[PDB]
Scaffold this active site. Structure first.
Site, mmCIF file in Angstrom:
data_model
loop_
_atom_site.group_PDB
_atom_site.id
_atom_site.type_symbol
_atom_site.label_atom_id
_atom_site.label_comp_id
_atom_site.label_asym_id
_atom_site.label_seq_id
_atom_site.Cartn_x
_atom_site.Cartn_y
_atom_site.Cartn_z
ATOM 1 N N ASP A 104 1.504 42.307 88.164
ATOM 2 C CA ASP A 104 2.642 41.627 87.522
ATOM 3 C C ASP A 104 3.798 41.662 88.523
ATOM 4 O OD1 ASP A 104 4.173 40.203 85.638
ATOM 5 O OD2 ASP A 104 4.234 41.822 84.189
ATOM 6 N N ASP A 109 -4.345 41.999 79.297
ATOM 7 C CA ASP A 109 -4.037 43.328 79.771
ATOM 8 C C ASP A 109 -3.240 44.056 78.703
ATOM 9 O OD1 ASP A 109 -1.416 41.840 80.797
ATOM 10 O OD2 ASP A 109 -1.025 44.000 80.622
ATOM 11 N N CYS A 141 -20.610 52.800 69.751
ATOM 12 C CA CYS A 141 -20.191 52.766 71.140
ATOM 13 C C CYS A 141 -21.214 53.372 72.094
ATOM 14 C CB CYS A 141 -18.844 53.497 71.285
ATOM 15 S SG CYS A 141 -18.196 53.532 72.984
ATOM 16 N N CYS A 150 -20.478 54.245 75.253
ATOM 17 C CA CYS A 150 -19.818 54.902 76.371
ATOM 18 C C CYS A 150 -20.299 56.332 76.548
ATOM 19 C CB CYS A 150 -18.305 54.789 76.189
ATOM 20 S SG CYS A 150 -17.501 56.156 75.350
ATOM 21 N N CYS A 178 -19.012 58.990 73.965
ATOM 22 C CA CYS A 178 -19.701 58.944 72.683
ATOM 23 C C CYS A 178 -21.142 59.400 72.781
ATOM 24 C CB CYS A 178 -19.606 57.523 72.116
ATOM 25 S SG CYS A 178 -17.911 57.149 71.596
ATOM 26 N N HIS A 230 -13.205 56.335 76.546
ATOM 27 C CA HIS A 230 -13.776 55.670 75.378
ATOM 28 C C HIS A 230 -13.043 54.379 75.029
ATOM 29 C CE1 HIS A 230 -15.087 54.617 71.343
ATOM 30 N NE2 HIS A 230 -13.812 54.614 70.987
#
Ligand SMILES: Cc1nc2cc3nc(N)[nH]c(=O)c3cc2[nH]1
Ligand SMILES: Cc1nc2cc3nc(N)[nH]c(=O)c3cc2[nH]1
Ligand SMILES: [Zn+2]
Ligand SMILES: [Zn+2]
EC number: 2.4.2.29
Lengths: 361, 361
Positions: free
Chosen positions: B92, B258, B296, B298, B301, B327
């Protein structure tokens, strides 16, 4: 694996290298144990701790009893399951952390510890190496007070033994270490040693040190203290220490170590290197593309610069703490490996001399 | 790879899915960009960010210019090298973060930003997707003030274009996005859109939103605003947002996103789940052996319980922040993948309805 088996594979002077076999895995000695007092080695995933080469980590009865609770952790499957470390864990007994009496100690909720309660908490945590509940004697101590405290700790040692042995599951799957006290006084250290050996333990810790007496004084006490312990069992120097403390201690017969320095001092900006520690916050590192240490094999030194880590710590970024800690723990583990290999090769004395020459240059 | 190529592979209503090809890699759209404003995605190693599925991360001109310094980072090899992320980075321009004039803005050391300086800093950082220097219009805004601000931003847009193009290396290896302003007013949004398209950019951001107007109002503006943009270039909604914001925005034609929420709200205890967010500090999780979310995939998890993560956050442990953030970023990336697949399969509208039904149940 057996419950507990310590084997010495090579010696040089007072130094030894070997292995402790336990149900949850093998521990290479001389060993460094990363400290994980709230069920986490601060800023590291357990797989990262393992990747650095640690065989075992330390937990703390006192802290875990307060948060999250020992009973709670048992209910959840034990400390190994809870934090995701499936290898051996040693737990300190709380004796380093009141209303005190022969029965034990109340802390203020209000909380009680005693040989019995300490041993029970360690069982509830599922620790593999259980430490006797003691009193770490403050320094400096007069001979009378050192003796009274040492004596109480030996009585507490026998109570710890009996509590441990009264719990079938614990007695069958874990190990129990006694802790020698006696401050800086040879006769008290001998008496404590004798008492511990008479009770009988799987390992013997040297307690009461690293509490303000200085390296020269610490080494002096170790000089006469470690030979008092049973030679055929591991010798653990609690809470020690800097790299150079560790080298000198192994030279005096110590097999196991733990300390908060690599983790704590990491998060504060201190990085261990073979040329001595550096504080990465120092402006001289702001544009230094070199890794933390020139020889280190850790993933941090493979990938990031001093300059970056400098920025992270100055910015108070969590990644800075993560990287600083991974490097310092890996550094400590590389130190332990170099010590093991050199003793195994009969060149440890040379190693220690070379080490000191560079670390202090 | 080309400097920049956006290809749309499938559409459903206003939604699109496709890819942006850049020299440093490919970006799957609709895309979520983890935010890394001080040259770190807070509490994650870049390899971890990548493992979660991110194709691109966001950096910030303003923050990096203050610390560590844009020139410093260039001297050290650029932002990719410095932080160890070798894939595309969007930066940005500072326009969201004074003494203001037609020339630019001075912040107070004292620091100046303008179209020229902003673009130069982004070049010094080595960003792949460069954002035009703008003014994000505060909300609420009167039509006159929205217009004056929008107008200035369009002049600044042309200055950003020209500065970018005046730098051969930048113009040849990076991309430049314009930012549409105009607050909540359709005519101003149209005028801004027209201005941006007349200049010509590689992508078009919808700016000025998520700054207090509410989801209903945000969606309303997107309803007329996104069709104003060139259809064949990516549409980026800056700083958005919660999972449900993202779904609705894709339904309105947005391709890129974002937001600080997954990282920031993670460190504060909020975990995203398909049944809605949870605050893991809540006492009801203290002995909950379930993972953060039931589906999930991930690593967090896979390995740790709510109970453990609850303990970590309550204890203020850094591992709690690391796990919560991994996560939440992985959750966000799984959301993006489900959106991409459903659009590709022509069942995105069903997906969004089902999503809302469960997330809000
Ligand atoms: C630096 C240092 N850490 C220590 C921990 C200790 N723990 C126990 N139980 N007992 C001890 O004597 C003891 C001594 C320590 N010194
Ligand atoms: C939540 C949110 N984040 C934003 C960031 C923005 N940046 C720029 N340059 N310009 C913007 O208008 C802008 C708007 C935002 N809204
Ligand atoms: Zn290293
Ligand atoms: Zn997860």
């Amino acid at each position: 694996r057996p419950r507990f088996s310590f084997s010495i594979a090579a010696r040089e002077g007072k130094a030894r290298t070997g292995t402790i076999e336990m149900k949850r895995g093998v521990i290479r000695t001389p060993a460094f144990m990363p400290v994980g007092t709230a069920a986490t080695v601060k800023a590291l995933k357990p797989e990262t701790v393992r990747a650095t080469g640690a065989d075992i980590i330390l937990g703390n009865t006192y802290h875990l009893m307060l948060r999250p609770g020992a009973e709670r952790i048992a209910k959840l499957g034990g400390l190994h399951s809870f934090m995701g470390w499936d290898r051996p864990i040693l737990t300190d007994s709380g004796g380093y952390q009141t209303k005190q009496s022969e029965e034990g100690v109340t802390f203020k909720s209000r909380h009680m510890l005693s040989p019995e309660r300490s041993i029970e908490i360690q069982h509830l945590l599922g620790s593999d190496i259980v430490m006797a509940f003691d009193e770490c004697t403050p320094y400096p101590a007069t001979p009378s007070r050192a003796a009274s405290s040492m004596e109480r700790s030996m009585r507490w040692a026998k109570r710890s033994r009996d509590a441990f042995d009264s719990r079938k599951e614990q007695a069958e799957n874990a190990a129990l270490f006694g802790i020698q006290q006696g401050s800086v006084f040879e006769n008290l250290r001998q008496q404590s040693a004798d008492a511990l050996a008479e009770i009988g333990f799987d390992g013997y810790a040297v307690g009461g040190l690293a509490v303000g007496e200085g390296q020269d004084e610490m080494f002096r006490v170790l000089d006469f203290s470690v030979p008092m312990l049973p030679d055929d069992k591991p010798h653990y120097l609690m809470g020690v220490g800097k790299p150079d403390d560790i080298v000198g201690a192994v030279e005096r017969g110590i097999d196991m170590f733990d300390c908060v320095l690599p983790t704590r001092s990491g998060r504060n900006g201190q990085a261990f290197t073979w040329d001595g520690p550096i504080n990465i916050r120092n402006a001289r590192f702001s544009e230094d593309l070199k890794p933390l240490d020139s020889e280190c094999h850790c993933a941090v030194c493979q990938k990031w610069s001093r300059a970056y880590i400098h920025h992270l710590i100055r910015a108070g970024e969590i990644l800075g703490a993560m990287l600083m800690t991974e490097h310092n723990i890996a550094f400590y583990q590389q130190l332990m490996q170099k010590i093991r290999d050199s003793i195994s090769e009969g060149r440890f004395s040379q190693f220690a001399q070379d080490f000191r020459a560079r670390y202090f240059a």
